[PDB]
């Protein structure tokens, strides 16, 4: 029974505060295709004053018009924002944390202590892989905890479960900007009817099951893109009469790599092999490089 | 233990637990209560209640208490009460060199206190007591035998009494009472085996039947019940009325609190002492500032090493061990006692049953025994006074402090028949035991 933290996030607030009461610079790993669904609910009232380094991953597939406003929004509030294609990997995102403190850090009173970094975000959007990439390499090349790297028991090699107490990853050394873990507080599974669509749309929570069939997100990625064009160019990419009238033809027109047991005279193709295609291809930013969220021009 | 001490002499025989709970009903004379209340004693403690009329009667007794439970009054008070009823009622003549009662005492600083606590009993009018210890030209200081002594109560270390006998200067002929103090250690090779060999010459005189029948009242007072103490009392003495209180004995006091410091390095045992000596104490008459404290050492080689290290670090430290001269040891005691010097680099001289004002015992080496620990610790908190004992245990004494730490949180008797000191006791746990290395395995691996 290996589930995760399960409960409304708006009750994980007064405990998140005392976690920020001691931290210095707040981080976050989001998805630029989902500027405010991958955010914790308090992002508004979370800190308002600690220097946030809010990062949007997979930005190369998120649209560029909505990228400007979301950039200058926090950039007006003061809290910074950085967008990355992730092809140039987190190694450059790490470089940001080397630069995005030297300019904004308050000078350390004691020459070598830390810059205690509070990280948040969904573990499946890039926050896990960002920790366990810097957490694994610290075991070999050593900065603190000062022991001979032998006491890690059998079958762990990593510990993001059952201890996660004072556990923290030293990302840098001379400006030792360390980073916390924040035991995963996001995607509560009590999500909204629609948020699970935009979440499974982006490849996040890639589970497509009885809880969320392909034909429920595929109906969503089709009806979101009612403007046929540069998306019908993916349809026209597979012999489609450009405009699809509705969900029946376009999904059935793309059954060239789909099908099941059908007669030699009347073929009864398979619309689920066409479902996953239309679903999973939009995940790759292949069909269109367009966001999902609405980007409130107002403050909210 | 109940399911024990049956297979052990001196016990399996009833223990007089008849509480009498007040001095009046113990029939102690109002000429002695006026002197007791004069001292400050109003209510009889647990050991006193039960063993004062067990010696007000002529029952040969084994007084056993915890620490600072009143044993010194317990045995001494009724013996003065008894001596007074000898010289007045029976009119048994004093004679010259023939004392009515002897008292024994292990250490020189213990002999003297047993004299002033008995000196304060001149309300027991005719009784005159003289104590004696080593001196210079001291054999020429039995002049106080040729001189006025006639001392009905003669408190002395056993060895000097024995020489006054074998050279025909003492004559236990009329020894009516024979008391022993801190007998746990005194009746053993630990001191000299000289408490014994003195019982017997007394034991062989009251069964001589050609001089008057002076049935000498033997009184043993011992905080510890050792295996040695049992047999040389259970097997030789006649009708030993025991006074053991098995539900408060072989345990450190309640209001006393213990502290265990784990020390990894030989030279680190020092800072932990000075850091402990930052409690800033100073009294009227009982560069750095320590409280009332005794520091107990493994050896007198070291008891002066640290002493000089303390002094040269700025404390008013004192020093008391055996190899000191006569003037220095007399002085260095009369400074610690009576206000001055506030801290006493002592060896196991100060462990053996001494009373004062001390309030904090540093075990500069937690001892390897349960007597050498109850005797040091038991000097801290006496008769309801609060008190702290700090233990600088090491890697080598870890076991004994693995268990002391565990027996205290439970308040258990420290292996209720203590050992390792008087009864050296290769039987760790007292019976025909050599504990096994248990099993029922029966697999017996093959290759």
């Amino acid at each position: 029974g290996a589930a995760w933290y399960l409960g409304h996030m708006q009750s994980a607030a007064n405990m998140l505060a005392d976690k920020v009461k001691d931290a210095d610079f707040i981080l976050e790993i989001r998805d630029a295709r989902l500027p405010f669904t991958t955010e914790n609910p308090n992002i508004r009232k979370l800190t308002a004053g600690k220097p946030r380094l809010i990062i949007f991953n997979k930005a190369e597939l998120s649209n560029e018009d909505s990228n400007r406003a979301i950039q200058e929004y926090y950039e007006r509030n003061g809290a910074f924002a950085l967008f990355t294609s992730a092809r140039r990997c987190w190694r450059d995102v790490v470089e940001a944390v080397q630069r995005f403190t030297t300019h904004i850090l308050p000078p350390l009173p004691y020459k070598t202590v830390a810059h205690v970094g509070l990280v948040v975000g969904m573990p499946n959007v890039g926050k896990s892989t960002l920790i366990n990439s810097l957490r694994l390499a610290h075991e070999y090349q050593f900065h603190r905890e000062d022991f001979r790297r032998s006491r890690s028991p059998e079958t762990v090699s990593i510990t993001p479960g059952t201890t996660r107490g004072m556990k923290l990853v030293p990302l840098s050394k001379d400006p030792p900007v360390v980073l916390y873990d924040t035991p995963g507080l996001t995607l509560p599974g009590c999500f909204t009817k629609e948020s699970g669509l935009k979440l499974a749309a982006c490849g996040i929570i890639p589970t497509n099951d009885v809880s969320l069939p392909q034909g429920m997100v595929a109906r969503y990625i089709y009806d979101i893109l009612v403007a046929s064009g540069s998306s019908e160019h993916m349809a026209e990419c597979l012999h489609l009469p450009r405009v699809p009238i509705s969900f029946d033809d376009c999904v059935a027109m793309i059954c060239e790599r789909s099908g099941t047991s059908g007669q030699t005279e009347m073929g009864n193709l398979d619309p689920v092999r066409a479902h996953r295609f239309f679903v999973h291809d939009f995940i790759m930013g292949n069909l269109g490089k367009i966001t999902l969220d609405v980007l409130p021009r107002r403050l909210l | 233990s109940p399911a024990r001490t049956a297979q052990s002499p001196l016990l399996a025989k009833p223990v007089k637990t008849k509480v009498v709970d007040n001095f009046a009903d113990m029939l102690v004379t109002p000429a002695l209560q006026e002197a007791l209340a004069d001292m400050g004693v109003s209510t009889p403690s647990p050991i006193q209640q039960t063993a004062i009329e067990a010696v007000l009667q002529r029952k040969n007794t084994v007084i056993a208490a915890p620490h600072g439970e009143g044993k010194t009054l317990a045995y001494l008070l009724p013996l003065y009460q008894n001596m007074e009823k000898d010289r007045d009622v029976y009119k048994i003549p004093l004679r010259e060199r023939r004392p009515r009662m002897i008292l024994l005492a292990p250490t020189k600083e213990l002999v003297e206190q047993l004299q002033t606590v008995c000196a304060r009993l001149d309300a027991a009018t005719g009784l005159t007591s003289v104590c004696f210890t080593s001196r210079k030209r001291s054999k020429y200081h039995l002049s106080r035998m040729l001189k006025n002594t006639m001392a009905d109560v003669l408190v002395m270390d056993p060895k000097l009494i024995l020489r006054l006998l074998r050279t025909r200067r003492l004559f236990i002929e009329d020894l009516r009472y024979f008391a022993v103090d801190e007998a746990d250690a005194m009746m053993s090779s630990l001191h000299d085996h000289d408490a014994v060999q003195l019982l017997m010459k007394v034991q062989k005189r009251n069964q001589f039947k050609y001089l008057w029948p002076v049935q000498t009242q033997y009184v043993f007072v011992t905080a510890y019940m050792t295996r040695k103490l049992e047999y040389i009392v259970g097997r030789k003495i006649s009708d030993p009325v025991t006074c053991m209180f098995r539900q408060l004995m072989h345990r450190p006091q309640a209001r006393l609190r213990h502290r265990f410091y784990a020390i990894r390095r030989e030279p680190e045992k020092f800072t932990v002492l000075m850091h402990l000596l930052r409690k800033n104490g100073h009294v009227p008459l009982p560069f750095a500032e320590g409280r009332r404290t005794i520091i107990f050492f493994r050896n007198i080689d070291a008891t002066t090493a640290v002493f000089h290290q303390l002094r040269s670090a700025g404390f008013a430290v004192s020093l008391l061990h055996a190899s000191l001269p006569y003037k220095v040891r007399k002085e260095m005691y009369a400074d610690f006692a009576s206000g001055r010097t506030n801290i006493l680099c002592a060896t196991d001289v100060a462990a053996r049953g001494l009373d004062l004002h001390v309030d904090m015992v540093i075990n500069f080496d937690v001892p390897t025994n349960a007597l050498a620990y109850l005797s040091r610790s038991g000097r801290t908190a006496r008769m309801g006074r609060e008190g702290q004992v700090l233990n600088l245990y090491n890697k080598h004494q870890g076991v004994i402090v693995s268990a002391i730490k565990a027996f205290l949180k439970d308040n258990l008797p420290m292996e209720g028949l203590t050992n390792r000191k008087a009864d050296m006791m290769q039987p760790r746990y007292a019976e025909w035991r050599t504990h096994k290395i248990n099993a029922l395995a029966r697999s017996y691996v093959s290759l």
Binding site: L6, T162, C190 | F245
Partner: protein
């Protein structure tokens, strides 16, 4: 305990010391001595202190003789029996130191499946809570309780707090003396003692097994997970159930039977929402977001909150037996909301 006997030694209190005079009381049983000197404590309040150790001891000699209620006194030792007077302190002294209209006093009598001189078993309606949450407002069982006082017993005491959305069978004890006995029947079983029925949507893994999850309640409502296979050992307790999928909708639902060996919070539903990730039908608190009712041919109008959680406390094996030697097993029949989906599926609802 060794510290409990310490403060007992170091407490003056008023320590009502009670002599045992030569004539009237020497020889009497101690529970006569206390009960005719201290009329304030009920006799049962006097047995607790006399046996518990916060006792009225007796002191003759140098030790305290804690005693059983029948130990008789001694021949005038002026053997004092000390009794406690100001327990309140570090001691923490022991226990003992609207209106229900009709249509309720009747409503609470159709919810009775079994009654004898020692318990009462009811049939709780799915959705009525037990403890009050809107402190003046909600109609719960504890406010109803002075309705099952059949034969004028003293306000039955609730024994195991069924949850809000959980339907089913409850047990009240009809006697504060029986309630002490009926404790060992609930907490941390070794073998099952109760059956929970439910309709989880989505055929789980193998239709027999045991679930061991390690719950952790972070306030508010954190509700954590397996995190330690052994335990976090500090803030975690485990909840074990031996589930059996009795029958199963072919691949989209199942009718599961949980035998909850433990007593953890929503342990039925949180372990069901992660036996597969197939939660119970209408479980909007832990699962419940797959769809509104998880999108079936059931009553599907409001849905968003229509479908009530198909969970039913089905059977409890009481320890009271019956005229024939069998132990009694209440069999609270399913609510219509489960009788809906059982007959809509044609299963033989076993009452």
């Amino acid at each position: 305990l060794s510290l409990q006997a310490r403060e007992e030694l170091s407490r003056k209190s008023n320590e009502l010391q009670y002599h045992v005079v030569t004539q009237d009381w020497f020889g009497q049983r101690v529970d006569d001595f206390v009960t005719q000197h201290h009329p304030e404590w009920d006799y049962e309040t006097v047995k607790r202190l006399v046996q518990q150790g916060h006792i009225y001891r007796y002191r003759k000699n140098g030790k305290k003789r804690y005693t059983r209620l029948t130990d008789r006194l001694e021949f005038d030792e002026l053997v004092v029996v000390p009794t406690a007077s100001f327990w309140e302190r570090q001691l923490a002294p022991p226990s003992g130191v609207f209106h229900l209209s009709a249509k309720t006093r009747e409503m609470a009598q159709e919810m009775v499946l079994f009654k004898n001189e020692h318990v009462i078993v009811i049939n709780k309606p799915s959705g009525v809570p037990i403890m009050p949450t809107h402190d003046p407002l909600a109609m719960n069982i504890t406010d109803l309780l002075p309705a099952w006082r059949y034969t004028n017993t003293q306000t039955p005491v609730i024994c195991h707090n069924l949850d809000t959305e959980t339907s089913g069978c409850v047990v009240l004890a009809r006697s504060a003396n029986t309630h002490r006995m009926l404790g060992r029947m609930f907490v941390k079983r070794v073998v099952p003692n109760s059956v929970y029925w439910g309709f989880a949507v989505g055929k789980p893994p193998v239709n027999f097994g045991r679930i061991r999850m390690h719950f952790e309640v972070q306030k508010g409502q954190g509700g954590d997970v397996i995190v330690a296979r052994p335990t976090p050992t500090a803030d975690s307790k485990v909840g074990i159930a031996e589930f059996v999928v009795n029958a199963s909708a072919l691949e989209f639902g199942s009718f599961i039977s949980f035998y909850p060996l433990t007593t953890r919070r929503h342990q039925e539903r949180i372990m069901a929402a992660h036996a597969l990730r197939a939660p119970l039908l209408g479980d909007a608190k832990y699962g419940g977001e797959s769809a509104f009712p998880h999108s079936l041919s059931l009553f599907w109008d409001p849905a968003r909150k229509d479908v009530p959680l198909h969970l039913h406390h089905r059977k409890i094996q009481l320890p009271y037996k019956n005229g024939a030697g069998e132990f009694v097993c209440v069999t609270a029949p399913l609510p219509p909301h489960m009788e809906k989906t059982f007959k809509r599926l044609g299963w033989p609802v076993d009452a």
